[PDB]
């Protein structure tokens, strides 16, 4: 049931960085463990990953720099609600 989402305005997409959003009541300790589990599973497939930020307070989850090749694997992680590719915002 976890889904992937990317910006519909193709020139505004920022491939290579993903926001992994966990289920509403996921605790910070569980978010950190899930991020470490993704780094380990990715490493077993020969991929480097970098955890840029671990979210807590509004939305549990984390920001990860990695190949989009790992998205099928990442969507199967425990507690995952959905994953969104990063995208641009502009001054109005």
């Amino acid at each position: 049931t976890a889904t992937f989402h990317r910006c519909a305005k193709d020139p505004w997409r920022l491939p290579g960085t993903y926001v992994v959003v966990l289920k509403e009541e996921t605790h910070l300790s569980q978010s950190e463990r899930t991020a470490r589990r993704l780094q380990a599973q990715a490493a077993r497939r020969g991929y480097l990953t970098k955890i840029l930020h671990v979210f807590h307070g509004l939305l549990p989850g984390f920001l990860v720099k990695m190949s989009g090749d790992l998205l099928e694997l990442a969507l199967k992680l425990p507690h995952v609600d959905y994953i969104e590719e990063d995208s641009s915002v502009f001054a109005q």
């Binding site: 989402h5 910006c7 519909a8 305005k9 505004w12 920022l14 960085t17 926001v19 959003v21 840029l52 930020h53 979210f55 807590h56 307070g57 509004l58 939305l59 920001l63 959905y82 969104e84 990063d86 995208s87 641009s88 915002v89 502009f90 001054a91 109005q92």
Partner: protein, 287 residues
């Protein structure tokens, strides 16, 4: 005489309006020593911005600070601000070219909530004078901050399009603001202009708005856009919440609609199917 926009929001000059409210601004860097906003804006340590496009980019403070300095002035400026008593806190999520990321904006929204939990003050208003494409995560983060009791105000977008295709404009819990001009008509910006549709809550002055210019410590310049319109609504919300601090988000939205000027926009400017969906309201202060 007075700037047209400040006269327009006055029912047909409060010197310390909005003093109980703190307004967070997620935007470019700001010239915090500009006479219009010095002492009223506190620059947080927060910065999360993408690299500027072009390897030979020159980072000149006067250009980097333009957008955010003008909007801080519209909200609380000594001479030309709406809520002259409101305190502001700035977070840098837009680079020198006015570009940011969804992830940087998310980290900024989290920083605001964390700051509030550590040292609570009065009601908070968060101004997001930015837009990107529809984002599930940005809408979700905005919805969660609003549900936590924080008031969010955003620009409708400057794409002469349906605001529901943009974020955070499309988040229902965020107050989404379109722009109108001195003739109370929707603002044109080059070949585009203000967004419209069912995701817009109301309109506010957004063309030729006098505000602080980062060119010099006493300089002023006119700017246009839905960012300027959203800044007027953030100022009006700070004034309404300072007068009635117990208002819930639903009650505040009701007050904004009640005191708005009604049916002054010519709906012919909007595409045919958007006329019944776009609210014909121009924001104004209560009497």
């Amino acid at each position: 005489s007075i700037p047209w926009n400040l006269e327009r929001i006055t029912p047909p000059q409060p010197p310390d309006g909005g003093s109980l409210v703190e307004v967070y601004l997620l935007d470019t860097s700001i010239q915090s020593d500009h006479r219009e906003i010095e002492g009223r804006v506190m620059v947080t340590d927060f910065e999360n911005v993408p690299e500027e496009d072009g390897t030979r980019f020159h980072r000149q403070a006067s250009k980097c600070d333009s957008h955010g300095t003008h909007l801080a002035g519209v909200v609380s400026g000594r001479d030309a601000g709406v809520a002259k008593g409101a305190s502001m806190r700035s977070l840098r999520v837009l680079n020198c070219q006015g570009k940011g990321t969804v992830s940087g904006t998310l980290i900024g929204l989290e920083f605001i909530r964390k700051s509030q939990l550590v040292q609570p003050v009065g009601p908070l208003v968060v101004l997001l004078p930015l837009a990107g494409g529809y984002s599930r995560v940005l809408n979700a983060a905005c919805q969660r901050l609003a549900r936590a009791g924080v008031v969010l105000v955003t620009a409708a977008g400057n794409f002469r399009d349906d605001a529901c295709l943009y974020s955070p404009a499309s988040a229902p819990e965020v107050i989404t603001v379109g722009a109108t001009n001195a003739q109370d008509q929707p603002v044109t910006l080059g070949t585009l202009g203000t967004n419209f549709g069912r995701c817009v809550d109301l309109f506010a002055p957004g063309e030729d708005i006098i505000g602080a210019s980062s060119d010099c410590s006493t300089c002023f310049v006119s700017q246009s856009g839905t960012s300027q319109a959203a800044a007027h609504v953030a100022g009006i919300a700070a004034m309404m919440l300072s007068a009635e601090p117990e208002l819930t988000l639903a009650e505040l939205r009701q007050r904004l609609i009640h005191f708005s000027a009604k049916d002054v926009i010519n709906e012919a400017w909007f595409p045919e199917d958007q006329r019944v969906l776009t609210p014909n309201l121009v924001a104004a202060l209560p009497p």
